[PDB]
Amino acid sequence: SGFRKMAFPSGKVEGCMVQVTCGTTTLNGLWLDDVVYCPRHVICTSEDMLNPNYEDLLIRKSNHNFLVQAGNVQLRVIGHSMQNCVLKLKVDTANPKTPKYKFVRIQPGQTFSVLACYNGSPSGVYQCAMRPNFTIKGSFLNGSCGSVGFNIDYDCVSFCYMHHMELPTGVHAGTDLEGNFYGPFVDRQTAQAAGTDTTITVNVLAWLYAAVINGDRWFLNRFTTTLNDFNLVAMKYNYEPLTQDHVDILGPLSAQTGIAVLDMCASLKELLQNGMNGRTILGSALLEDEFTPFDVVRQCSGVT
Amino acid sequence: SGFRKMAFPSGKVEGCMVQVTCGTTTLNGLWLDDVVYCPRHVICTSEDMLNPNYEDLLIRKSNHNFLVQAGNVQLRVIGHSMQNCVLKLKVDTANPKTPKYKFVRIQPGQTFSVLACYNGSPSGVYQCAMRPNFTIKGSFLNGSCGSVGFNIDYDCVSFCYMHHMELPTGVHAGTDLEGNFYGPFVDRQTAQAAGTDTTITVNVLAWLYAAVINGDRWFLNRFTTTLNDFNLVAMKYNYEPLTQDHVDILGPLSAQTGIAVLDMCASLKELLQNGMNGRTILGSALLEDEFTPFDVVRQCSGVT
Numbered sequence: 009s010g011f012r013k014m015a016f017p018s019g020k021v022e023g024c025m026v027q028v029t030c031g032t033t034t035l036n037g038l039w040l041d042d043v044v045y046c047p048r049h050v051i052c053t054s055e056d057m058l059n060p061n062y063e064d065l066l067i068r069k070s071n072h073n074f075l076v077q078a079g080n081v082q083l084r085v086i087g088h089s090m091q092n093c094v095l096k097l098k099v100d101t102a103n104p105k106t107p108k109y110k111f112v113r114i115q116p117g118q119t120f121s122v123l124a125c126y127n128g129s130p131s132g133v134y135q136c137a138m139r140p141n142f143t144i145k146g147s148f149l150n151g152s153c154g155s156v157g158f159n160i161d162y163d164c165v166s167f168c169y170m171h172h173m174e175l176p177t178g179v180h181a182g183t184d185l186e187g188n189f190y191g192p193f194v195d196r197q198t199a200q201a202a203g204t205d206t207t208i209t210v211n212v213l214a215w216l217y218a219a220v221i222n223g224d225r226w227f228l229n230r231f232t233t234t235l236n237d238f239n240l241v242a243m244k245y246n247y248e249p250l251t252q253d254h255v256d257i258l259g260p261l262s263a264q265t266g267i268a269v270l271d272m273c274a275s276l277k278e279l280l281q282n283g284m285n286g287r288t289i290l291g292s293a294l295l296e297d298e299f300t301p302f303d304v305v306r307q308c309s310g311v312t
Numbered sequence: 313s314g315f316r317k318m319a320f321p322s323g324k325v326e327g328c329m330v331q332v333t334c335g336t337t338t339l340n341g342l343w344l345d346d347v348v349y350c351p352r353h354v355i356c357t358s359e360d361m362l363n364p365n366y367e368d369l370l371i372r373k374s375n376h377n378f379l380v381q382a383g384n385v386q387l388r389v390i391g392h393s394m395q396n397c398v399l400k401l402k403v404d405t406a407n408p409k410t411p412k413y414k415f416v417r418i419q420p421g422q423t424f425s426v427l428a429c430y431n432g433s434p435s436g437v438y439q440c441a442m443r444p445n446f447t448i449k450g451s452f453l454n455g456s457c458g459s460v461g462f463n464i465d466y467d468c469v470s471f472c473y474m475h476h477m478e479l480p481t482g483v484h485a486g487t488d489l490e491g492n493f494y495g496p497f498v499d500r501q502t503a504q505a506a507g508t509d510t511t512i513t514v515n516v517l518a519w520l521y522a523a524v525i526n527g528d529r530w531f532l533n534r535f536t537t538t539l540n541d542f543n544l545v546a547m548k549y550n551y552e553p554l555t556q557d558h559v560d561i562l563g564p565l566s567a568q569t570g571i572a573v574l575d576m577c578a579s580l581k582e583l584l585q586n587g588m589n590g591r592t593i594l595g596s597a598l599l600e601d602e603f604t605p606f607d608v609v610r611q612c613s614g615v616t
């Protein structure tokens with residue numbers, strides 16, 4: 009029993025982190041096979057970041073300008089290419105610690121673990137969600153760029169995120185491992201404002217199921233609702249609309265608890281309308297939206 | 313910027329986790345050098361756990377009754393001894409992945425990372441605090457016993473916790489790596505009730521400093537207080553008394569923010585007296601007490 013915000017074990021990703029230095033910029037790279045992935049803005053001065061022309065900046069860089077250090081051993085760079093907003097540095101040595109991996113582009117609402125790194129060295133690991141406005145609420149200081157977000161399926165690491173920038177509002181923007189930003193963000197130091205940070209309704213319902221499963225039940229009520237009635241309330245509270253696809257995904261938690269999804273919706277509806285009245289659910293005074301239904305099933309069944 | 317509940321990277325500890333099976337009980341062990349550490353109740357039936365005589369139960373066990381599996385390779389057990397509530401299984405092979413390590417007994421209020429494991433396989437990692445009542449609020453299912461809590465100083469893993477039991481209230485009790493329980497708990501399935509779960513005042517103040525440092529400042533007020541005045545309010549709210557030692561420890565966060573510890577105490581005093589009024593601090597609707605002053609400095613400076 010007990011329910012915790014839980015990251016994947018980070019070992020498989022620790023073994024992939026390297027330091028990339030270009031000129032006087034140092035940040036993190038991801039070493040998989042004989043390729044090192046890193047944010048293209050490694051080639052920028054802070055001055056460049058105001059209005060960078062990356063193709064133009066890159067012309068002035070050779071393989072030997074990309075200094076790549078794994079532990080305290082330098083990797084030989086034998087090639088470099090730009091793909092979207094990442095550089096791929098071909099090194100002469102395959103990472104001997106390369107795990108089985110995929111690159112996946114996640115949807116908003118999906119959760120992942122971040123291994124915060126500085127100078128290619130892991131500092132800590134935390135669980136994130138891709139927000140519906142395509143930001144993440146991370147913990148990133150200067151030097152953390154190139155830190156990656158990932159899920160693990162048994163022995164396969166799916167890389168979904170690379171850290172690129174902080175918005176003036178202190179939220180975070182990055183790319184998948186093909187270098188395409190989540191949302192409309194650009195690797196340029198400009199006016200970039202996040203859209204509405206809506207609550208991931210399906211995740212709140214998963215976490216209410218996790219609560220019931222762990223003995224926190226005070227918020228179960230005598231009511232039910234409909235997807236349409238519920239969604240009117242969700243709209244009013246800047247909650248994402250709930251779809252039949254969401255209901256379907258909550259099916260197993262429904263089955264396990266014997267609480268119909270629409271009943272739990274009615275419970276969430278009253279919580280939105282009435283607030284928590286100073287009570288807590290799984291040690292939180294607000295409704296948690298960074299557990300997926302898949303995360304709840306995983307933690308409540310003890311998958312490895 | 314941004315502030316997250318952050319675990320240490322788990323890689324160094326992943327490489328230490330093994331499966332221990334005695335009869336029909338399977339749980340996790342910690343493999344350091346040529347010793348495997350595990351909860352002594354591995355030798356118990358569920359029947360035994362009602363009133364176990366561990367010295368008597370152990371007489372019936374030989375080295376070859378302790379089945380130890382690292383990945384899918386069996387370790388040869390050449391010795392076994394009971395120290396307090398852990399077994400030490402001497403194996404014929406030094407763990408080639410043994411990190412630099414210490415065993416430390418932490419104080420209540422101190423935080424650590426847990427690597428939740430099942431069948432010697434890591435499932436996830438989260439940050440805990442040792443509660444003032446010597447419980448932790450973990451996420452542990454059957455099979456998770458022998459999962460360990462740890463801090464890392466650069467390359468040295470300090471092991472502070474091994475998981476042993478869930479109380480009927482769904483909080484968790486365990487030992488240091490010398491097998492001595494935190495608090496009054498016994499590895500027996502009996503009436504064991506936790507004492508008062510008080511709030512770790514020094515940790516709440518550290519986290520209020522983390523908030524100010526990260527731009528959440530609405531709760532800064534025009535007031536100050538005294539240790540004595542503050543402590544009257546702390547008593548009333550089941551907060552731990554604040555000592556000069558606590559004030560001293562908050563000195564650097566004081567220095568960095570230019571907010572005197574006693575001023576921040578006055579801010580906390582008003583938050584206790586007035587509540588949050590539906591506002592949030594670092595995305596929480598209650599006062600977080602599972603960051604140490606050392607944790608705040610670490611995450612706010614980017615240590616590896």
Ligand SMILES: *CC(=O)N1CCN(S(=O)(=O)c2ccc(C)cc2)CC1
Nearest residue numbers: 032033034035053054150151152153
């Ligand atoms: C986001 C990130 O890690 N990087 C790499 C470091 N650069 S920088 O331009 O070298 C820089 C370092 C430190 C400060 C305080 C500012 C800028 C930024 C991008």
Ligand SMILES: *CC(=O)N1CCN(S(=O)(=O)c2ccc(C)cc2)CC1
Nearest residue numbers: 336337338339357358454455456457
């Ligand atoms: C806490 C823990 O992991 N252990 C090891 C497993 N035992 S047990 O007695 O084998 C057991 C397993 C599963 C259930 C549902 C009950 C008991 C408990 C202690």
